[PDB]
């Protein structure tokens, strides 16, 4: 029971690294509350994900989806999952 590696030919894609850990719609940290809930002060403010793997507070991406339909961060229509 023994295999060994003599060669490995790898393939990679280089891009610029953009660290987006905010909600694109209300602009504050995903991991804390959205703008609208800090207006309401004092678990039901979750983050929704799209087939595009982009994430926004579920609260924002709703109000946003009221007037628009293509993900705030790409060219495709927004799709939950």
């Amino acid at each position: 029971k023994r295999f060994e590696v003599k060669k490995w030919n790898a393939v990679a894609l280089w891009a610029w690294d953009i660290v987006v850990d905010n909600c694109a719609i209300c602009r504050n940290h995903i991991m804390d509350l959205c703008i609208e809930c800090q207006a309401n002060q004092a678990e039901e403010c979750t983050v929704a994900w799209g087939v595009c793997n982009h994430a926004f507070h579920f609260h924002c991406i709703s109000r946003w989806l009221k007037t628009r339909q293509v993900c705030p961060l790409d060219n495709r229509e927004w799709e939950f999952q």
Partner: protein, 360 residues
């Protein structure tokens, strides 16, 4: 399918399956292909297919002739502008910078660290190449040294870049000790990973591999069905349907120690059958989206020009300009316009009904 088959045909001619094609005569047949092309409706479909096709050739050195390849890029650019052969030429220049980049990594290693394997990598610019993310793959320990050692190397190279490893395109070479003879296996990186697993036990279930290689079973199933094709691995029943007998998360896999082959270097890295379909479907979706981008582009070239225009006049211009690359569908341009407003590139003139204006 006609504009697609023409591209697939070009692959045929500029691909080497080891048999050398007379140089000069192919120049005539390339120039022949270029004439059946000018008579194509959905040019843009040929483009996507001929790029994704030129892609597989470059990455695997599988190119019949260095000269023919660029010969077709001077014809295509002369027949569809520099938009059509923008990404193409960038892929050539990319492979070259990669070649240069690799060496520059060997030297840095030559003077400093050891390497347990012969490593070779192709960095490609995340934009030009028609490839996609792998499938959540768990990296084998031996390769990992070459991973981190390069990722760290690259961090030095550039300020804000990032690497995205495409394991579903990476290959390599295993060497066998556990068989009658000494074989050199030419295996995909998915393969290598399941083979290195039999360096402890000699049998796992379909569910145990998915847990130790993180390979989504969908793709893990198609792979094992190749590892059973070659008698490298086998199951409890040495008679089952080699093609039709689907596996289950509970079906076992056994390392066949009776491996025999009439040659020392084998190629087990064969194209699996569900690939020429799945990659076709994905390319179609990328075309459909590419058209949408082309259109937004038109809408903006036009709106930018005549600062105000009525919906119907817009549609007609957009068709006029794109007519040479393809046969746009009306409902789409509608949608592109709409998106363009959500993007704030153009707005609706209040009072006016379906008159749009560009937002400088």
């Amino acid at each position: 399918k006609s504009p697609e088959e023409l591209a697939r045909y070009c692959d045929s001619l500029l691909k080497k399956s080891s048999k050398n094609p007379e140089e000069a005569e192919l120049e005539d047949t390339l120039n022949q292909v270029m004439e059946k092309f000018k008579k194509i409706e959905d040019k843009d479909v040929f483009q996507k297919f001929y790029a994704k096709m030129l892609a597989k050739r470059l990455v695997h050195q599988n190119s019949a002739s260095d000269d023919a390849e660029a010969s077709m890029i001077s014809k295509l650019k002369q027949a569809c502008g520099f938009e059509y052969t923008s990404k193409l030429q960038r892929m050539f220049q990319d492979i070259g910078v990669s070649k240069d980049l690799n060496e520059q990594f060997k030297k840095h290693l030559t003077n400093s660290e050891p390497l347990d394997l012969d490593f070779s990598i192709q960095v490609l610019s995340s934009g030009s190449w028609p490839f996609q993310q792998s499938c959540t793959f768990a990296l084998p320990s031996e390769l990992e040294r070459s991973y981190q050692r390069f990722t760290a190397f690259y961090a030095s190279r550039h300020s804000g870049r990032k690497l995205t490893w495409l394991y579903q395109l990476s290959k390599g070479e295993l060497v066998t000790n556990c068989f009658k003879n000494r074989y050199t296996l030419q295996a995909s990186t998915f393969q290598m990973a399941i083979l290195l697993q039999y360096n402890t036990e000699d049998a796992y279930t379909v569910q145990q591999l998915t847990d130790s290689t993180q390979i989504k079973m969908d793709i893990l199933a198609q792979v094992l069905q190749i590892l059973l094709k070659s008698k490298l691995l086998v199951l409890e029943d040495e008679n089952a349907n080699v093609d039709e007998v689907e596996l289950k998360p509970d079906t076992l896999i056994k390392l066949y120690l009776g491996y025999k082959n009439k040659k020392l270097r084998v190629n087990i890295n064969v194209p699996m059958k569900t690939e020429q379909k799945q990659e076709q479907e994905t390319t179609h979706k990328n075309i459909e989206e590419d058209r949408k981008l082309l259109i937004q582009a038109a809408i903006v070239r036009i709106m930018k020009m005549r600062k105000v225009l009525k919906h119907q006049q817009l549609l007609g211009e957009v068709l006029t300009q794109l007519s040479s690359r393809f046969k746009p569908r009306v409902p789409v341009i509608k949608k592109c316009i709409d998106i363009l407003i959500e993007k704030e590139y153009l707005e609706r003139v209040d009072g006016e009904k379906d008159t749009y204006s560009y937002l400088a």
